[PDB]
Structure formats: structure tokens, C-alpha cells
Amino acid sequence: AEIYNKDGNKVDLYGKAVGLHYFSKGNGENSYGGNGDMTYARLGFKGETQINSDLTGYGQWEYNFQGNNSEGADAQTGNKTRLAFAGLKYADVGSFDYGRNYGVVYDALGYTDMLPEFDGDTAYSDDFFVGRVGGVATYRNSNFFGLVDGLNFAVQYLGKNERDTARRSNGDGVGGSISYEYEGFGIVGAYGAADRTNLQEAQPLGNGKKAEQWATGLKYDANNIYLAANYGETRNATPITNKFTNTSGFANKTQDVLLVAQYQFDFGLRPSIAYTKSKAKDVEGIGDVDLVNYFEVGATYYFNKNMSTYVDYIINQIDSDNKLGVGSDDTVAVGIVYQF
């Protein structure tokens, strides 16, 4: 909601309280989503100031406050800043921003990140260019310097992030994406490669000194319809754990498919049908193994722009004999959302 707006600056303080619960049999250990209360809230801000007619400066911070922790020792578990960046946009020259933001490959994955509850599977955090990452300088151009309506690109420079953890770490890399959108249609291609840190390499699984990820996407967005599909691959980027050996590393290779079909009725009900499969190749020891494999059926009802509720159902296709220990059980998410 725009709480402020005077002297060319407008602030939008936003957020949401989400009452959420996951239903999966057992202790949700062998299920897709786990089981139980998963309530949380979000608070963030989106500022934007008009330095003059062509120039705009802006910033954005979004945080994630878990709502399923005690007020005890575990009170902080799960909390975190998701985004944090400032930037500038100049006339038709493009925009530039730096901070914790979305990797460029997500310019593609974003297409199928539309399930009611469950977040796009391959769009992981602090995992190179696919999801939110720290210290990324990102340039974006729209309409090819205003010469070509609908043609946009982006390039992105990722700073090395040497964390205490091989999974949350990354070396320096570059990434770019080109997309084109003409009347309800959209096509995209994204790609980025990056150095792997000593620790990432000291890991038992995955072998390389460079990590890559690219995805392409196609979408039809219009007439209350939303059909979207993505296909991409990766090398030594995808984080995987062998639950048996308690071994971890990155998938040498993966092939990721995502499809999403949705319809927005005029009365508020938005049904969703999706399919996601990601399979690792050449995992050291196991060979080929599926990481994510399921169908999804669900529906969201929008009371209005501030209230909605939804049920998301995961028909997990993974099988009980999955070598990595990847869970085979179903998960049903029911949630109620208020937001501003």
C-alpha cells in the first residue's frame, strides 16, 4: 500500500499475514512439503523518487518473519531478508541496481513460479543465478533503448560470496537474459556461469570449477488464461543431499521441466494445474535420480486484492525407491492470506 507520496517520492509499505498449514502423512519427513503449521508474515518497502523527468531512483527491502516458532530459543528460525537493493533508471537507457536481488535466470523461471502455495522448485535461494542471491549488480534494458517495442535484456554481475557453507556460497560470475513479449506472448532465454568456491569444490558430490544454469521459457498470458512452460539445465549448480549417506554437494547435471496452466474466473476462483520434473544426471554414486517429480492441482479464491485463500495439492510422482531419499508422499497446503 502506498503510505507516502509527496515531493516526487512515493513509498509503498507492503506486507501480509499468511495463516498456513501443511497436511502430509507421517512426520512429513518422507513427504513433499513436510507437515503442520507454516504460518508466516512479510513486511517490506518499495521506494521510488523522481530525480527529474528521465531519472528515477528506487529501493526495496522485503523481510520474512516466520509465524510458526515459539517465543523461546527458536523464535528466529526461518526469518530473513529476501530482497535489499537500491538502483536507478534513466530514460530509455536502462536501469541498474545492486544488492540482494533475483538472479537473471529467474527472468525465465519466473514464468512457472505461479503455483498457489508451492514456490517454483528449481528457483532455489543463494544458488547462483536461479533465485535470490547476495551482491548482484544488474543492468536491464527495455524496448531495446526504446527502439524495439517489447525487446528487453539484462546482464548481471555476481560478486563472490564466500559463506561458511558450500551451499550458500558462490564465486564470481556473469549472467544475462533476453526476452521478447508481443501481445500476450512471451519468450525468454537466460544463462549464467560462475566460479565455484574452494568449499563448494571440497564437497563430496558434484565435480567442476565452474557452475552453469540456463533456462528458457514460453508463456501465453492473456484472456484470463495463463499457460507457462520452462525448460532448463544446470551443471554443478543444483544442491542435492543423499539422505542415506548424509552426503551433500551439487548435481553434476540436471534437466528441469515445468509447465503451468491456470484460469482466472471473473468471480475470483483461479484454478491451477501444473507439472514439474527435475532429474539429476551422473550423481557421483547413484547415476540418474529424480529430484522433483509431481503434479499439482489447486485453486486460489480472491475475495479481493487484500484477501484470498487457497488449497494447493501436490501429487508427488517421486517413488519410494528414490536413491537420494527424496520424499515420495503427498502434501496439501491450505492457507488464508491477508495483505496490503
Provide the Cα torsion 324, 196, 124, 134; round to 10°: 150
**Taking a C-beta distance cutoff of 8 angstroms, is the pair 188, 217 a contact?**
yes
DSSP character for 57?
A: E
241 bridge partner residues: 248
Angstrom distance (rounded) from CA 7 to CA 327: 54
Residue 270 binding: pick among ligand C8E, a second copy, none (C-beta 5-8 Å cut-off by kind): none
Exactly one of 29, 37, 92, 119 binds a second copy (CB under 8 A); that residue is 37
With CB under 8 A as the contact rule, the residue among 53, 223, 305, 321 that binds a second copy is: 305
Query: Which of a second copy, ligand C8E, none has residue 210 at its interface (CB below 5 to 8 Å by kind)?
Result: none
Q: Which does 245 bind (CB under 5 to 8 A by kind): ligand C8E, a second copy, none?
A: none
User: Which residues of this protein are in contact with ligand C8E, per CB under 6 A?
Assistant: 19, 21, 98, 137, 157-159, 172-174, 334, 336
165 binds a second copy (CB under 8 A): yes
Shortest Å, Cβ 136 to ligand C8E:
8
Q: Tell me the closest approach of the beta carbon of residue 100 to ligand C8E, in angstroms.
A: 13
Segment (H or E) for 109:
helix 106-109
Contact of residue 157 among a second copy, ligand C8E, none (CB under 5-8 Å per partner type): ligand C8E
Name which of residues 109 to 138 contact a second copy (CB under 8 A): 125-126, 132, 134-135
29, 119, 303, 319: which one binds a second copy (CB under 8 A): 303
Question: Phi-psi bin for 109: left (phi > 0), alpha (psi -120 to 50), beta?
Answer: alpha
User: Nearest Cα to 299, choosing from 262, 336, 339?
Assistant: 262
Taking the complex as a whole, the smallest distance from the CB of residue 311 to ligand C8E amounts, in Å, to 9
d(CA 184, CA 101): 26
Strand pairing report for 225-235 and 253-263:
antiparallel
Per CB under 8 A, the segment of 57-65, 140-148, 220-228, 282-290 that binds a second copy is 57-65
